[PDB]
Amino acid sequence: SELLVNTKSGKVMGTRVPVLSSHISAFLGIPFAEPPVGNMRFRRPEPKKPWSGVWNASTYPNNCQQYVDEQFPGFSGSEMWNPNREMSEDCLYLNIWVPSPRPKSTTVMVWIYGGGFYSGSSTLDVYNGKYLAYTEEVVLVSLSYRVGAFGFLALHGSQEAPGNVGLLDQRMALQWVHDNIQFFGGDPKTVTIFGESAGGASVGMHILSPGSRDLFRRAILQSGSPNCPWASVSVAEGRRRAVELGRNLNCNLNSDEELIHCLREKKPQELIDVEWNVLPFDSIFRFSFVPVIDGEFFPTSLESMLNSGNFKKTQILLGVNKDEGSFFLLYGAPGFSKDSESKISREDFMSGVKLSVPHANDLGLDAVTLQYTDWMDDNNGIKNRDGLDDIVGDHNVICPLMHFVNKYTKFGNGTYLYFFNHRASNLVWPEWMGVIHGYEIEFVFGLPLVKELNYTAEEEALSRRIMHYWATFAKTGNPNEPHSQESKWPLFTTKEQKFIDLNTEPMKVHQRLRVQMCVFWNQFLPKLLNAT
Amino acid sequence: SELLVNTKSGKVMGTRVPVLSSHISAFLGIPFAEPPVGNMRFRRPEPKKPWSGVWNASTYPNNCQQYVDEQFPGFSGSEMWNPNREMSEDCLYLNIWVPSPRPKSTTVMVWIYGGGFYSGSSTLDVYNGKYLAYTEEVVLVSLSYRVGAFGFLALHGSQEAPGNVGLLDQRMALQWVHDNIQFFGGDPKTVTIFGESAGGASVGMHILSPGSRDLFRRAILQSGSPNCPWASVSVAEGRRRAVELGRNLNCNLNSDEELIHCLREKKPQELIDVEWNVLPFDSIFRFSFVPVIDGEFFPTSLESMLNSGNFKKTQILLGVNKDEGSFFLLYGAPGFSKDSESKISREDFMSGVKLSVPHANDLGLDAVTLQYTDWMDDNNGIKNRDGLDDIVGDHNVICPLMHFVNKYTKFGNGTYLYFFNHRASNLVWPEWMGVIHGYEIEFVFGLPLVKELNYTAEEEALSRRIMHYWATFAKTGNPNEPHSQESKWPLFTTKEQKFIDLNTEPMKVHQRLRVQMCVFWNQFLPKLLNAT
Ligand SMILES: COc1cc(CNC(=O)CCCCCCNc2c3c(nc4cc(Cl)ccc24)C[C@H]2C=C(C)C[C@@H]3C2)ccc1O
Ligand SMILES: COc1cc(CNC(=O)CCCCCCNc2c3c(nc4cc(Cl)ccc24)C[C@H]2C=C(C)C[C@@H]3C2)ccc1O
């Protein structure tokens, strides 16, 4: 009845789940695409053919095939991001949480997981949608999409491995929401897509792509934007990395058809095992198989589309965390450790900036170094560590996003910008990592509202504020409730460039988020590298 | 008797001058060279031929031919720098102040005036040597040398206008001191040369030049150093500017001999009137006729001599003023005024950096701008004004001197570094100009001891401390009197890089004078300009 829904593709049976003191409806693992397996590996997705009978949607689906982190086995701080279900190429499913009783036609939010386009799962604990759907009375969807070579191997000109098929996976789930969410009590005219990291970049890519714009109303971008340096490659570089993946696996490289035929014969773990080997440089915050600027999903270069206003004009809400860089330094740069303060020598600092800006020449590396070194105190291990942290986060997340913010606001219909700088009281990662890449998500999804997770009362109130900002923005295009007496999150404007902090303290309005370093990263350094 | 002195060139009769409550002997206007007139214009100096009878040395000599500032007619702040005697090409004379009674063989200090190599006189009120000679019981000499085209027209390969002849004028006065100062009670084995601005660059150039090294014992450099970007040119640029001087005056330009012959026919003021026209760029802190890197007075490039230790190894004392740049901005940059606070617009700020770094490409101008602009507050007219002030002083005086200081200290026998930042109580220049280029000289020469000049008691104390540091350094190679109870000015070392402030407060020791900006000016910007 409430749990039995007839969709355009067939019937689905959800399940009644507890949430806090109440209950909500959950429809877990609904298929939206044909399994992209066998001869369909690397191909564009195809709509799921209708089924007879009742699809049992009481259970999370498989996760897509991906690299699995084993750096800290058993450590909750890293395991919380690993697949918590069996991995399978049969992984194109979505999950829906619907308030009980079913609303008539309420706001829809569609979550797009991040993970550098090489990892991510819709089924992670931290993406459990019941708290946001319950508390804010929205219909919450989480989609999935192929990652790694399965989603983004790009042999442009081939229609068997064209590239971007993971983005087309996301679009197909959006098309499914457009076509079916009304049967779950959602309004298909009021859909907000939101995501973090590669999911935030993805959200911005759908803003850019003509083939995506009519499938959602407005957008939220968390710690990611479509113009980030790690988020796309040229057709030439995607082709180089695909050929190099074949070479690592002794594939016939004579032609696209032969290379593709060889790669379709490999077991999924065989591709994953060599995935990192195709990167052109020793680097951090760089991923092998990512969206390709192809002329079809993206009509022209991202910058030209941004300059001409060739993108969906709507309202956006977006922001960054204080220490986006620490996670990537922990995993890939010398001198960093989970169990120490990680004071960074001068030698390791220099090694770090080379890894963080792998595409720079020697003059470029000197410019970065000078911009972030205190030459009154250059042997300070704390300042060297924090300076590397700022380099990674500024270059890869904050300044690309601020470039997007400024370009979008010229043509958009409303921008709201945040800076999340709260370090959770129960964080299991050490102090030096600060406010980590990914660790705003738990507040967005209302995990502080769960008593046994041991957040403070102030953190529950912060999560509730953030959920209400997100859902109110999704409903109306404005995170603020009218006639309310709390402080108002102001519009970001071209002239005043205002943003807010998100933390447990009363709201402060600031202007020009990290403007000094982002002039360096968005204007001077690109000019220097283009001139040298 | 006391006033009658027989020198190797002939007898001189000095004069008894009052000084504070006492008297000392002055020998004013002694010739040390043949008049460099007629066919000797642009030529190396020749020793003064011996004369019969008594040279009346009771009167200041003429000043050399030079551009005369008429920007603020009658204003004491600018006219204190103008020739206070008749100008003449017959100007190669020196002045001596001798304690009374005549010492047996005491320390000698020789003053070399600055003025951009285009102006300067030994006879200015602020260079009056009687206060320092009386108070510190030294024999004080001030020399003269040809400036502008008359001293530094350079047509390399010609022996008629070889270049650097003003530096040879200085050398010949030093040779005269070496041969004759014993007859005035001075010890030719304890001669300190000191100078400000171009005089300070000159001092450093005598340290470098083999033909100068044996004519003095140690050296003091004030707000100038031999490697300053304004202090020398290549033989090719020197030749180009000499040929452009001829073109401005309708000279035959077919050979050195005809060009030189044409220029020797001109009245002195005809050369002066077109002097500034030969500069390659619109600029500030750039001067037309300066030393040439010639392979003779300087064996190789100044940077290679500094790197190899090819210079005199002795003790040096040197330093800079807090606002070296303001005088040059007042006279040559848009938005600056003697009679206003000179808040600088963004447009005028950008005009100023182009004038301040005239040799930079657009990439280099962007680099300077970013290094000195607060992009949270870029329309702040005070920050824009002070930033341009810092650019001029850092680029032209402070960071060249710090490069010299660090290179020299690797090989020398003792370095003492100061930062003069006292703004005089009776300054006639506006407050935005701060601590001006040239305005430590009056403290070095003891003017605050003259009650009529209306300095404070603390400024008299400051002048007495500085005169004692300078003379004790001249005497011993160390500004400090060991066994005394005063705060000790420490050696500058390669590792610790210590320096003191000079002002009316108790002594503060600091380290790494303006190290952050000087890394930009001495390492990064030249590498950027060399790549592009
Ligand atoms: C070849 O280069 C390297 C490759 C690797 C392989 N390992 C990795 O890239 C990182 C391990 C896989 C992802 C770890 C779990 N994912 C996390 C994620 C996030 N934040 C994390 C924060 C911390 Cl402190 C720890 C893990 C986070 C936030 C989101 C973004 C990403 C990219 C993955 C995932 C979701 C390690 C070192 C290297 O030098
Ligand atoms: C080619 O560019 C320009 C050229 C000129 C030509 N005029 C000048 O450069 C100024 C002419 C000399 C007038 C000042 C010389 N005296 C000063 C001197 C010093 N400090 C001064 C400080 C102030 Cl506030 C005022 C004068 C000072 C310190 C010493 C150093 C110099 C260069 C000359 C003299 C001694 C004017 C505007 C321009 O844009």
| DSSP secondary structure of B130-181 | HHHHHHHT-EEEE-----THHHH---TT-SSS-S-HHHHHHHHHHHHHHHHG
Contacts of A381 (CB under 8 A, 6+ apart): A343, A344, A345
* Active-site entry in B136, B324, B440, B442: B324
* Active-site entry in B197, B232, B283, B288: B197
The alpha-helical segments, DSSP class H, found in A45-164 are 76-79, 130-136, 148-152
Q: Per the CB < 8 Å rule, is A367 touching B512?
A: no
Q: What ligand is nearest to the CA atom of residue B231?
A: 2
Please give, rounded to a whole number of angstroms, the shortest distance from the CA of B515 to a CA of chain A: 6
Distance of CA B334 from the midpoint of ligand 2 (Å): 16
Angle made by CA atoms A263, A145, A177, in degrees to the nearest 5: 145
φ, ψ at A394 (rounded to 5°): -65, -45
H or E, element range at B5: strand B4-7
* Selection from B386, B396, B444, B453 nearest residue B420 by Cα: B444
The token pair that represents A499 in the structure block = 């943003």
The token pair that represents B206 in the structure block = 């005598």
At residue A469, the 3 state secondary structure works out as helix
Spatial contact of B349 and B384, defined as CB atoms under 8 Å apart? yes
Taking phi over 0 as left and psi of -120 to 50 as alpha, with beta for the rest, A153 belongs to: beta
What DSSP assignment string belongs to A223-278?
Answer: S--TT-TTS-EEHHHHHHHHHHHHHHTT---S-HHHHHHHHHHS-HHHHHHHGGGG
Q: Per the CB < 8 Å rule, is A528 touching B375?
A: no
H or E, element range at A384: helix A381-393
The whole-angstrom separation of Cα B339 and Cα B64 is 32
At residue A33, the 3 state secondary structure works out as strand
A438 CB neighbour count, 10 Å cutoff = 18
Spatial contact of B182 and B265, defined as CB atoms under 8 Å apart? no
Distance of CA B33 from the midpoint of ligand 1 (Å): 79
Technique employed here was X-ray
The separation between CA B105 and the C-alpha centre of its own chain, rounded to angstroms, equals 27
The token pair that represents B345 in the structure block = 């617009």
CA distances from A15 to A122, A513, B92 (A): 18, 44, 105
Beta-bridged to residue A5, according to DSSP, are A12
The half-sphere exposure of B458 on its side-chain side, counting CA atoms within 13 A, is 10
The whole-angstrom separation of Cα A487 and Cα A504 is 14
At residue A10, the 3 state secondary structure works out as strand
Q: Per the CB < 8 Å rule, is A370 touching B515?
A: no
φ, ψ at B302 (rounded to 5°): -60, -35
Ligand 1 in reach of A411 Cβ (< 6 A): no
Catalytic residue check, A437: yes
Ligand 1 in reach of A276 Cβ (< 6 A): yes
Examine residue B291 and say whether the peptide bond preceding it is cis (omega within 30 degrees of 0). Answer: no
* Selection from A119, A471, A70 nearest residue A288 by Cα: A119
The whole-angstrom separation of Cα A265 and Cα A250 is 12
Cβ burial of B458 (10 Å; 0-12, 13-18, 19+) is middle
Angle made by CA atoms A447, A449, A450, in degrees to the nearest 5: 75
The whole-angstrom separation of Cα A440 and Cα B222 is 57
The token pair that represents B416 in the structure block = 């003492």
Size of interface A-B (CB pairs under 8 A): 44
Spatial contact of B284 and B333, defined as CB atoms under 8 Å apart? yes
A427 CB neighbour count, 10 Å cutoff = 14
The separation between CA B166 and the C-alpha centre of its own chain, rounded to angstroms, equals 13
| C-alpha R_g of chain B | 22
State the helix-helix crossing angle for A165-180 and A198-208, rounded to 10 degrees.
Answer: 70
Enter the resolution in angstroms: 2.1
Residue A508 DSSP label = -
The whole-angstrom separation of Cα B512 and Cα B489 is 15
The token pair that represents B369 in the structure block = 């701008």
Range of the domain at B504: 1-532
Spatial contact of B333 and B339, defined as CB atoms under 8 Å apart? no
Q: Which residues precede chain breaks (C–N over 2.5 Å) in chain B?
A: none
Q: What ligand is nearest to the CA atom of residue A352?
A: 1
Contacts of A295 (CB under 8 A, 6+ apart): A235
CA distances from A138 to A96, A98, A219, A240, A467 (A): 10, 7, 15, 44, 11
Beta-bridged to residue B420, according to DSSP, are B321, B502
Distance of CA B423 from the midpoint of ligand 2 (Å): 19
The whole-angstrom separation of Cα B78 and Cα B126 is 12
Contacts of B212 (CB under 8 A, 6+ apart): B171, B174, B205, B206, B312
* Selection from B316, B96, B317, B57 nearest residue B186 by Cα: B96
The whole-angstrom separation of Cα B461 and Cα B430 is 24
The whole-angstrom separation of Cα A292 and Cα A298 is 8
The token pair that represents B218 in the structure block = 């140690």
Instruction: Name the residue in chain A with its Cα closest to that of B365.
Output: A524
H or E, element range at B531: helix B525-531
Spatial contact of B233 and B450, defined as CB atoms under 8 Å apart? no
The token pair that represents A443 in the structure block = 């507040």
Distance of CA B265 from the midpoint of ligand 2 (Å): 28
φ, ψ at A10 (rounded to 5°): 140, 175
* Selection from B442, B491, B465 nearest residue B76 by Cα: B442
Single-letter amino acid code for the residue at B253: L
Beta-bridged to residue B26, according to DSSP, are B15, B97
Spatial contact of B42 and B153, defined as CB atoms under 8 Å apart? yes
At residue A502, the 3 state secondary structure works out as strand
At residue B425, the 3 state secondary structure works out as coil
At residue B280, the 3 state secondary structure works out as coil
Chain A positions touching B519 (Cβ under 8 A) are 370, 375
Range list of β-strands (E), B353-469: 415-420
Contacts of A321 (CB under 8 A, 6+ apart): A223, A393, A397, A419, A420, A421, A435, A436, A437, A439, A440
* Selection from B222, B198, B195 nearest residue B147 by Cα: B198
Spatial contact of A315 and A323, defined as CB atoms under 8 Å apart? no
Q: Per the CB < 8 Å rule, is A527 touching B376?
A: no
φ, ψ at B258 (rounded to 5°): -75, -40
The whole-angstrom separation of Cα B502 and Cα B498 is 13
The whole-angstrom separation of Cα A228 and Cα A397 is 7
Q: Nearest 10 degrees: CA dihedral of B263, B123, B201, B371?
A: -100
Spatial contact of B197 and B220, defined as CB atoms under 8 Å apart? no
Angle made by CA atoms A135, A139, A485, in degrees to the nearest 5: 40
The whole-angstrom separation of Cα A381 and Cα A162 is 47
Distance of CA B180 from the midpoint of ligand 2 (Å): 35
Please give, rounded to a whole number of angstroms, the shortest distance from the CA of B26 to a CA of chain A: 48
φ, ψ at B90 (rounded to 5°): -80, 85
Distance in angstroms between the alpha carbons of the first and the last residue of chain A: 67
State the helix-helix crossing angle for B256-264 and B235-248, rounded to 10 degrees.
Answer: 50
Taking phi over 0 as left and psi of -120 to 50 as alpha, with beta for the rest, B432 belongs to: alpha
* Selection from B224, B525, B524 nearest residue B400 by Cα: B224
Chain B positions touching A366 (Cβ under 8 A) are 523-524, 527
Ligand 1 in reach of A352 Cβ (< 6 A): no
Beta-bridged to residue A420, according to DSSP, are A321, A502
The token pair that represents A246 in the structure block = 């074949």
The whole-angstrom separation of Cα A316 and Cα A401 is 12
Single-letter amino acid code for the residue at A273: D
Please give, rounded to a whole number of angstroms, the shortest distance from the CA of A353 to a CA of chain B: 16
The whole-angstrom separation of Cα A438 and Cα A77 is 11
The residue whose CA is least distant from atom 4 of ligand 2 is B332
Single-letter amino acid code for the residue at A508: K
Cβ burial of B76 (10 Å; 0-12, 13-18, 19+) is exposed
Cβ burial of B349 (10 Å; 0-12, 13-18, 19+) is buried
Residue with tokens 């990537």: A328
What DSSP assignment string belongs to B180-210?
Answer: HGGGGTEEEEEEEEEEETHHHHHHHHHHH-H
The shortest CB-CB distance from A366 to any of B374, B524, B532 is to: B524
Spatial contact of B136 and B106, defined as CB atoms under 8 Å apart? no
Residue of B346, B368, B369, B370 for testing the chain A interface, max A β-carbons within 10 Å? B370
Looking only at the bridges linking them, the beta strands covering A10-13 and B509-511 are unpaired
Examine residue B101 and say whether the peptide bond preceding it is cis (omega within 30 degrees of 0). Answer: yes
Q: Per the CB < 8 Å rule, is B376 touching A516?
A: yes
Contacts made by residues B245-253, CB under 8 angstroms, sequence distance 24+ = B245/B149, B245/B153, B245/B271, B245/B274, B245/B275, B245/B278, B248/B274, B248/B277, B248/B278, B249/B274
H or E, element range at A516: helix A515-519
The token pair that represents A267 in the structure block = 């077991």
Taking phi over 0 as left and psi of -120 to 50 as alpha, with beta for the rest, B344 belongs to: beta
The whole-angstrom separation of Cα A130 and Cα A142 is 11
Spatial contact of B407 and B304, defined as CB atoms under 8 Å apart? no
Residue A523 DSSP label = I
Single-letter amino acid code for the residue at B285: F
Ligand 1 in reach of A429 Cβ (< 6 A): yes
Beta-bridged to residue A219, according to DSSP, are A193, A316
Spatial contact of B191 and B216, defined as CB atoms under 8 Å apart? yes
- As for how many domains chain B has, the answer is 1
The whole-angstrom separation of Cα B60 and Cα B123 is 7
Per 3-state DSSP, chain A is made up of helix, strand and coil in percentages (nearest 5) of: 40, 15, 45
Spatial contact of B60 and B95, defined as CB atoms under 8 Å apart? yes
Q: Per the CB < 8 Å rule, is A363 touching B531?
A: yes
Q: What ligand is nearest to the CA atom of residue A336?
A: 1
